[PDB]
Design an enzyme around this catalytic site. Structure first.
Site, PDB file in Angstrom:
ATOM      1  N   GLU A  85      31.362  38.736  54.177  1.00  0.00           N
ATOM      2  CA  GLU A  85      32.737  39.181  54.415  1.00  0.00           C
ATOM      3  C   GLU A  85      33.714  38.513  53.452  1.00  0.00           C
ATOM      4  OE1 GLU A  85      33.383  40.272  59.061  1.00  0.00           O
ATOM      5  OE2 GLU A  85      31.735  38.934  58.513  1.00  0.00           O
ATOM      6  N   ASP A  86      33.375  38.571  52.166  1.00  0.00           N
ATOM      7  CA  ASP A  86      34.159  38.157  51.000  1.00  0.00           C
ATOM      8  C   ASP A  86      34.171  36.653  50.766  1.00  0.00           C
ATOM      9  OD1 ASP A  86      34.843  40.727  50.221  1.00  0.00           O
ATOM     10  OD2 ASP A  86      36.660  40.746  51.454  1.00  0.00           O
ATOM     11  N   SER A  87      33.414  35.863  51.518  1.00  0.00           N
ATOM     12  CA  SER A  87      33.268  34.458  51.178  1.00  0.00           C
ATOM     13  C   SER A  87      32.399  34.317  49.934  1.00  0.00           C
ATOM     14  CB  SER A  87      32.671  33.685  52.348  1.00  0.00           C
ATOM     15  OG  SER A  87      33.414  33.875  53.536  1.00  0.00           O
TER      16      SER A  87
END
Lengths: 271, 335, 35, 343, 70, 43, 210, 116, 46, 253
Positions: D52-54
């Site tokens: 989730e975009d980490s």
């Protein structure tokens, strides 16, 4: 010769690189050996700076960080002590090294401040340690800063002993190559193809050291990983054979610490 | 509308979020300094006076510790200036304003708070660094990702308030949403991409990895499943290892298009007494869908068992996917 | 005038904690006025 | 940037001109003042800490100076002249004849009342000493004593700002009043919670950092400076990210700037051909081993350099907590503002 | 900004080679790839370090920390 | 002590003297760094 | 009058203690209960000190000799107890003591912490004690904060006639195990005044110094 | 800033035991052993060596969170055989193997230097 | 404090055995240095 | 370290004899003679202790007490060997002069003791004080002496005094003391407790956390005080008088 133990075949060596095969060994042992060779071998590096005069165009912690990565000779690092153990206040004579840096831009043309200008003023007590590592032809080594007319830099450096598990500056190995099973006999990797997987993937240099599999042979479901091909390069501080030997020694000492603690606990249980 | 319906408050914090696959479903990682600033007024009693005394001795510059001591009469002693960290003797009825300690309930939300499920309770775990930590399955009710979102933390200051946060607003109790009577959480993103690659008929597992995987499941009972291929080499099928996470007594039947009682396409799903008989598990099984595994587990066992299930599945599938590997490249768009 | 009712020392020694909205005696640590 | 006393300034230690440049950049001068660095990126799933975009980052890379930025701040002050008498003076205050002194340490101030360059200031310290004379008829409702002939008007630092004072400047304004400007320096290092972005709308935050031992490696001993998740490619259809990766890899292996301008003749197959001349799998995949156990990985991994920029949002500037504190004069409710420790 | 002393990826040292690298580019009139490989830079990460470096230290040096305008 | 802004001339100024340079007469004056280096610990 | 000596080996191995235990197994008559020892150093935090005044203070805690602490500074010794059974009855009776004292280390590290601060700590636990013919030998592994430090040997005898011969014999026994860098000491703090535990602590300090 | 000190990775705190052994309540002859300030380097080696003993039934390890340096090991052996004895045998075998490896490498390096 | 009849029989057998051992050890010492430290893994065959 | 719970008072010597009898009527025990000698030491002013954390007040400097018992052969003059060694000798100890002079005490140069100001608040019925104690058994070296030891720590001598009195042991560990105090200087010896006896009744508690025991101790002390109503008034002394920190100087005597 020790025929009951791990076997080794060195093919190539130099001041920096060692290229070899390790056979009759588990995969866990070789992996642990490489992890220790990268992470847990002590070395000598600059750990504190104090500055007197700074008339340059760079910052202070900038030059401090640049100095903290310069490589220095650490062959006899076994005879120093961790500064958290030495009874001296601050830095010892037995638990540190001290250098000084002075430079001034008298000339009109800009003057480079290299790492050949670090001068050691402490007492070494006849130990081979503290010398800067120089690997270029001209001998100047790591260039540190730049000066113009009327600019001066004066500072003092304290270098200590540690490992690479706390900063990347103490690491003595640059990058180590670790390969095994170039024919995928064991079916450990599964290839990705468009038309023909056997052609898209190039061949490793190591294929010449094993015999290709034959299409008539059923999949051998009993083999295990036994032969590894390694290559190790050093930053320059420690000789590479010493890197390998010290990695083995450190692994031995860790296991021996486990053994000693276990024996102590068994004696406690006896009580 | 600015000072009587909503107003600024005390005992609160605000910080960016991040993802932590090792945390349980209803647990939040709280940075160290934020834990050193907020407090809680614990009452000195016979059951806590030893730990509370040690906490007062610790002081305000150490976690755990304390920051103020309130007497019976309402007077409040600042522990920092009063040298009496090692001097104050505590009595029954005094209050120690201690730091927030592991397993303290908190309220946690993201703005705008459009619906009920955007403000939920959590149990704290004190961690280093500056971010909050969340399980990767609660990011759906919050409509939140990890590219810069900040969320808000509110600390209760009593026993009744703590009980309300623990028995009403807890994350386990907010799985079946009442807007559309279906689960609002499920396995998402890469755990979902992995739990499918694991359960194909193609995937077989050797001994050592089965041992490590069975250790990872915290609810294991020490029994090693008998393999499916005893000879000429012991192997385990991914369905077999994944069945360990699933509780016992769970039954599920799902027939897809063109599936018979002996599925040739490996479609549908059959689970009998906790064991995957046949069927690949994917978005229709472990997702936020009606009649899936999550819904039946919640309606049969309870919210706590499903909360355990989330973390069991995540741990097993992430451990396996760490050694399998996965990627994506420009070669996948070529025809 | 603001004095500590326990130290009874004149002139009183007092430190204001602005970041906490408190007034604190610098000897016994007692909190005198809040907010 | 060395002279200017701007209110805020950020500088990057080592900037790198991109490996894939459009032809138009030669007019914006983006190869003279870049704004990012070429980072080795491996698109993969690894331990589940980049969902989730980490993203996941190599800690040894951080330690060697990747994405490290200098920070510069400034303050100003001047003597005010009420009526005909000078009502503000630059002098080090003394507790004998001053009231309402601040809890900050006045010790670092010189005799001139101005701190000197090269002193590690910290939270709530003072750098300018300002004293206000007060008329005798003005009394603070009994707070003032006989010898308190002046009041303190010093300017403390912001509660969180730390670092080293870098410059001090003394001048005069149009009215001839004295004028002081102080510039302060600091260093910022990436950490869990920062913000990074590629040139194709793909931005995220650091979620965990690993050391070179736990990083998956190739057979050649190369290690990814960062690892992103592949669940970000399909719904965004950023094929240009993949093409930029491939072309930058080919340019790094070859050693020449690779054109990436729009509406031109470069194709994917051509650069794949130029890639296979060097000895790598044509679609950019590579064989990588697990960092913990040392085994082989079943699936291959997309691998190569890219360009990333360090955005302006740090977690150190967003973190805030409050137990109690100052109130408001009228409504008596907690104040607004993070720098004023509000609710 | 002076050349990084070490490589951010493989730990190698490239700081000292910048001066000699600049020599090959105009004294010997070689191309960039062969010049990069002439100095033992074989991993493409070291080539990345040397190849894409913007040397900003020669601009600040014609300048003083006193009196920039706007 | 202080220092000029154009020629960087070395000047000493009192608490009452005009804030000017003696040789160039400019109105911009800079301080001088602490001559005695002071050690610190970052906490 | 009993005599004692202390030998410290710096380059020892983890298994050297077992090697010396087995190499002496022929003469070993019996074995007794294990022992422990603590070794702290405290530093002076005040800067206005004269040149001739020392800065350190060594605290040695003996666990087997009835829980006793010894403070050493500039060849000056001080012996403190902390057990209720070691209290002279006069102090209990007259009221000079409340009857339940504290160890002096708590006093140094709690109340006087603005004059003295801790700098290191070296510990030794689960040592072994062996009775040989007219001799008692104690062995233990020393652990600092970082890890293993070295080997410690302490010898105590009641008859002082042939102490030197026994020391030479033990030195030779270490010699066959190729432990060639060992520092020994049997000095006495005061030629006229003989206190056993003070002399033992002084010998420990002289052996353990760097 | 909340970044913990790095030296907490290799220096034990005071009052810390490098090993902690706890009997497992589910399976007979099973122990859970916690190691402090250690990572996969040691656990993988010890488990791979413990898998070679024909009297060892179960041997598995894990590192619960990558923030803290510590890990758990679990051992289960046959009746009439102590897991601590199995650990001791594994450590002895590892030490002997490493010694043989070091001797072989030194011999090969010296031979190469002669051929250098 | 013995609990089992088999335990009681074993206790009496050990009583006779170590009583004889003590008698003969005293006989040796009253004239001989025994060793109380040596433990052999396997009992010596008769 | 103990929590000492104490009550104080004073009496004139005229009733002394009578008082003694009454005590024996209650306790059932006879008095026992005792003496002691206390020396007070303070941190050296020559050394600047900048380590006192002025911005936080983590700690403040304090004074150390060293006590020792002295045999009666130093306190009995040539006129007093005829009488037996019992409590009645106190009846002759009314003069400011005493056989033990400055030179003998200087020739002497144990129990080391530190204390804190009693607990604050006005809801305390007995003086509760915290005491940290240790014992010095012996010493050696080239300068083995109490003075050299305390100078090594960093302390210097301030004054000294001599206590002589009687002790009563009652049930529950209650100790009652009747004292006479003689301050000693090179200038001479002066009896501060002139024409009277100082009375102190106290109990010790080993652990401050235990509160049932503390409540029992307070109950016993208040019962004892309520037994002696009408004869002697036992009172809680001033909290600001039992403060022994260096910054502020006063001495309850």
């Amino acid at each position: 010769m020790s025929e009951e133990g791990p076997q080794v075949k060195i093919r190539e060596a130099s001041k920096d690189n060692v290229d070899f095969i390790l056979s009759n060994v588990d995969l866990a042992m070789a992996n642990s050996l490489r992890r220790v060779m990268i992470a847990e071998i002590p070395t000598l590096a600059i750990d504190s700076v104090e500055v007197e005069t700074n008339t340059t165009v760079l910052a202070d912690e900038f030059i401090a960080h640049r100095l903290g990565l310069i490589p220095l000779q650490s062959m006899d690092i076994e005879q120093l002590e961790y500064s958290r153990d030495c009874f001296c206040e601050d830095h010892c004579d037995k638990c540190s090294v001290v250098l000084t840096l002075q430079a001034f831009g008298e000339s009109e043309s800009t003057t480079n401040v290299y790492s050949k200008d670090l001068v050691i003023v402490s007492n070494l007590m006849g130990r081979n340690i503290g010398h800067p590592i120089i690997q270029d032809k001209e001998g100047n080594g790591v260039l540190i800063c730049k000066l113009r007319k009327g600019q001066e830099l004066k500072l003092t450096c304290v270098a200590k002993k540690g490992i690479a598990k706390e900063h990347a500056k103490w690491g003595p190995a640059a990058a180590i190559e670790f390969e095994y099973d170039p024919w995928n006999k064991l079916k450990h990797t599964d290839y990705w193809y468009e038309q023909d997987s056997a052609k898209e993937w190039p061949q490793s240099k190591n294929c010449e050291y094993e015999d290709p599999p034959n299409e008539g042979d059923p999949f051998d479901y009993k083999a295990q990983a036994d032969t590894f091909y390694m290559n190790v390069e050093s930053v320059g501080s420690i000789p590479v054979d010493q890197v390998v030997v010290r990695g083995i020694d450190t692994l031995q000492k860790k296991v021996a610490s486990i053994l000693l603690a276990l024996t102590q606990m068994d004696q406690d249980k006896v009580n | 509308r600015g000072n009587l319906m909503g107003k600024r408050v005390d005992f609160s914090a605000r910080t960016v979020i991040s993802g932590d696959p090792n945390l349980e479903l209803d647990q939040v990682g709280v940075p160290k300094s934020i834990a050193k600033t907020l407090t809680y007024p614990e009452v000195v009693t016979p059951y806590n006076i030893d730990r509370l005394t040690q906490l007062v001795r610790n002081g305000p510059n150490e976690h755990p510790g304390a920051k103020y001591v309130i007497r019976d009469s309402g007077d409040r002693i600042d522990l920092r200036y009063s040298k009496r960290a090692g001097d104050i003797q505590l009595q029954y009825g005094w209050k120690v304003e201690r730091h927030i300690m592991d397993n303290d309930p908190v309220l946690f939300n993201r703005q705008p708070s459009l619906h009920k499920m955007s403000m939920m309770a959590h149990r704290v775990k004190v961690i280093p660094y500056s971010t909050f930590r969340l399980n990767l399955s609660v990011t759906s009710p919050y409509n939140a990702d990890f590219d810069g979102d900040e969320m808000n933390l509110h600390v209760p200051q009593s026993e009744e308030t703590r009980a309300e946060l623990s028995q009403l607003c807890a994350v386990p109790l907010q799985i079946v949403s009442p807007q559309s009577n279906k689960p609002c959480m499920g396995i998402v993103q890469d755990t979902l991409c992995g739990i499918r690659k694991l359960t194909l008929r193609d995937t077989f597992i050797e001994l050592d990895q089965v041992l490590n995987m069975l250790y990872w499941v915290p609810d294991w009972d020490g029994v090693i499943p008998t393999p499916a291929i005893i000879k000429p080499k012991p192997l385990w099928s991914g369905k077999q290892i994944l069945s360990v996470a699933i509780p016992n007594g769970i039954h599920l039947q799902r027939f897809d298009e063109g599936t018979t009682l002996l599925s040739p396409k490996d479609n549908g799903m059959l689970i009998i007494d906790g064991q995957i008989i046949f069927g690949v598990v994917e978005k229709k099984t472990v997702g936020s869908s009606n009649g899936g595994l999550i819904h039946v587990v919640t309606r049969e066992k309870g919210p706590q068992v499903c909360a355990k299930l989330f973390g069991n599945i995540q741990k097993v599938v992430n451990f396996w996917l760490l050694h399998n590997g996965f990627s994506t490249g420009i070669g996948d768009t070529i025809a | 005038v603001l004095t500590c009712p326990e130290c009874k020392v004149y002139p009183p020694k007092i430190v204001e904690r602005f970041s906490e909205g408190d007034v604190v005696c610098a000897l016994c640590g007692l909190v005198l006025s809040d907010k | 940037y060395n002279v200017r006393m701007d209110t805020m300034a950020n500088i990057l230690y080592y900037p790198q001109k991109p490996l894939g440049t459009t032809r138009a950049m030669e007019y914006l001068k983006f190869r003279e003042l870049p704004a990012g660095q070429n980072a080795i990126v491996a698109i993969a799933c690894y331990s589940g800490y980049n969902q989730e975009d980490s993203m996941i980052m190599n800690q040894s890379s951080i330690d060697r100076g990747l994405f490290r930025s200098l920070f510069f701040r400034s303050y100003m002050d001047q003597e005010k002249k009420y009526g005909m008498s000078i009502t503000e003076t630059f002098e080090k205050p003394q507790r004998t004849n001053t009231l309402r002194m601040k809890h900050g340490t006045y010790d670092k101030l010189d005799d001139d009342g101005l701190i000197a360059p090269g002193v590690r200031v910290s939270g709530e310290d003072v750098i300018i000493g300002k004293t206000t004379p007060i008329s005798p008829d003005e009394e603070e409702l009994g707070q003032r004593t006989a010898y308190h002939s002046k009041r303190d008007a010093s300017t403390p630092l912001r509660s969180t700002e730390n670092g080293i004072v870098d410059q001090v400047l003394v001048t005069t304004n149009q009215d001839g009043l004295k004028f002081v400007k102080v510039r302060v320096r600091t260093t910022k290092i990436p950490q869990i919670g920062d913000k990074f972005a590629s040139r194709h709308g793909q931005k995220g935050t650091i979620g965990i950092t690993y050391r070179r031992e736990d990083m998956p490696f190739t057979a050649e001993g190369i290690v990814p400076d960062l690892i992103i998740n592949p669940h970000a490619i399909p719904s965004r259809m950023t094929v240009a990210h993949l093409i930029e990766c491939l072309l930058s890899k080919v340019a790094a292996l070859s050693g020449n700037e690779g054109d990436a301008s729009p509406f031109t003749d470069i194709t994917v197959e051509g650069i794949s051909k130029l890639l296979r001349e060097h000895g790598y799998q044509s679609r950019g995949f590579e064989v990588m081993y697990n960092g913990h156990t040392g085994k082989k990985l079943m699936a291959q991994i997309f691998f190569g350099p890219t360009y990333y920029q360090r955005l302006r949002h740090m977690v150190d500037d967003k973190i805030h907590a409050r137990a109690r504190g100052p109130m408001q004069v009228l409504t008596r409710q907690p104040v607004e503002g993070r720098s004023r420790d509000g609710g | 900004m002076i050349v990084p002393v070490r490589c951010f990826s493989c730990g190698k040292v490239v700081g000292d080679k910048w001066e000699s690298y600049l020599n090959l580019l105009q004294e010997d009139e070689l191309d960039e790839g062969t010049a990069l490989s002439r100095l033992g830079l074989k991993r493409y990460c070291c080539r990345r370090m040397i190849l894409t470096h913007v040397d900003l230290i020669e601009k600040f040096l014609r300048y003083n920390p006193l009196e920039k305008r706007d | 002590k202080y220092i000029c802004a154009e020629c960087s001339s070395k000047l000493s100024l009192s608490r009452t003297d005009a804030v000017r340079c003696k040789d160039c007469g400019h109105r911009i004056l800079l301080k001088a760094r602490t001559k005695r280096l002071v050690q610190f610990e970052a906490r | 009058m009993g005599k004692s000596a202390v030998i410290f080996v710096e380059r020892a191995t983890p298994a050297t203690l077992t090697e010396l235990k087995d190499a002496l197994s022929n003469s070993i008559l019996s074995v007794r209960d294990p022992w422990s020892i603590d070794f702290r150093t405290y530093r002076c935090s005040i800067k206005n000190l004269p040149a001739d005044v020392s800065k350190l203070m060594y605290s040695i805690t003996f666990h087997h000799h009835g829980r006793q602490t010894v403070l050493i500074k500039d060849n000056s010794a001080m012996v403190t107890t902390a057990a209720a059974a070691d209290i002279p009855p006069a102090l209990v009776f007259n009221g000079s003591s409340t009857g339940v004292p504290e160890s002096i280390d708590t006093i140094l590290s709690s109340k006087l912490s603005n004059i003295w601060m801790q700098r290191q700590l070296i510990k030794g636990d689960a040592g072994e004690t062996l009775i040989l013919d007219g001799l008692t030998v104690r062995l233990v592994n020393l652990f600092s904060s970082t890890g293993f430090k070295g080997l410690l040997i302490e010898l105590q005898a009641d008859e002082a006639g042939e102490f030197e011969t026994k020391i030479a014999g033990i030195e030779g026994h270490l010699a066959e195990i190729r432990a060639k860098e060992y520092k020994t000491s049997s000095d006495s703090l005061g030629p006229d005044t003989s206190n056993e535990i003070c002399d033992l602590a002084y010998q420990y300090v002289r052996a353990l110094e760097l | 800033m909340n970044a913990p000190d790095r030296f907490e990775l290799f220096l034990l705190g005071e009052g810390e035991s490098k090993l902690k052994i706890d009997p497992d309540t589910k399976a007979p002859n099973a122990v859970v052993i916690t190691f402090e300030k250690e990572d996969h380097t040691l656990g993988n080696l010890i488990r791979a060596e413990l898998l070679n003993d024909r009297k060892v039934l179960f041997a598995a390890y894990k590192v619960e969170h990558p923030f803290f340096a510590r890990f758990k090991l679990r051992i289960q052996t046959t009746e009439g055989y102590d897991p601590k004895d199995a650990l001791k045998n594994a450590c002895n075998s590892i030490i002997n193997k490493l010694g043989a490896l070091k001797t072989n490498f030194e011999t090969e390096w010296n031979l190469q230097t002669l051929a250098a | 404090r013995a609990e089992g009849p088999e335990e009681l029989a074993r206790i009496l057998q050990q009583l006779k055995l170590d009583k004889i051992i003590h008698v003969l050890t005293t006989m040796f010492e009253n004239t001989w240095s025994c060793s109380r430290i040596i433990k052999i893994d396997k009992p010596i065959r008769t | 370290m103990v929590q000492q719970l104490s009550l104080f008072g004073s009496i004139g010597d005229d009733g002394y004899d009578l008082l003694i009898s009454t005590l024996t009527t209650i306790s059932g025990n006879p008095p026992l003679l005792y003496n002691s000698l206390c020396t007070v030491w303070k941190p050296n002013p020559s050394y600047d202790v900048e380590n006192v954390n002025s911005r936080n007040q983590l700690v403040e400097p304090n004074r150390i007490k060293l006590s020792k018992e002295v045999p009666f052969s130093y306190l009995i003059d040539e006129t007093m060997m005829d009488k037996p060694l019992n409590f009645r000798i106190l009846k002759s100890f009314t003069n400011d002069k005493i056989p033990l002079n400055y030179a003998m005490t200087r020739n002497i140069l144990w129990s080391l003791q530190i204390s804190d100001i009693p607990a604050a608040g006005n809801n305390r019925s007995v003086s509760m004080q915290t005491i940290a104690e240790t014992i010095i058994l012996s010493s050696a070296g080239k300068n083995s002496s109490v003075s050299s030891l305390m100078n090594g720590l960093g302390y210097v001598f301030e004054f000294q005094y001599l206590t002589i009195g009687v002790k009563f042991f009652m049930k529950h560990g209650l100790i009652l003391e009747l004292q006479k105090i003689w301050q000693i200087e090179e200038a001479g010896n002066s009896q501060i407790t002139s024409g009277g006896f100082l009375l102190k009744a106290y109990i010790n508690v080993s652990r401050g956390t235990d509160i049932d025991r503390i409540n029992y101790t307070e109950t016993a002390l208040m019962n004892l005080k309520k037994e002696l109503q009408g004869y002697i008034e036992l009172s809680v002394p001033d909290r600001q008088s039992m403060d022994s920190r260096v910054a502020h100087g006063n001495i309850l005597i």
